[PDB]
Amino acid sequence: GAISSVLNDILSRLDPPEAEVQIDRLITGRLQSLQTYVTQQLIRAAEIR
């Protein structure tokens, strides 16, 4: 949802307050992707056990 997928690009363009709005979509999107990976590892770990 952010304008760009690079942190340095949004930080050097949008203002700190505006970048936080875009950074929120970056972190929120990455958190859902990070938790999805950890959730799959816990499920895959159970099958290995």
Next chain:
Amino acid sequence: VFNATRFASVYAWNRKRISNCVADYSVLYNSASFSTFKCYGVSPTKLN
């Protein structure tokens, strides 16, 4: 562009391409001349 005597019309406006040069944006931002200065794409202090 900025200091030109007479700009073109808003109906048909003059588009000037600026490439291969040194852009100093501090003279325009710091000095008080123009009333409205705002940057939508980037920050006004990071222009340089």
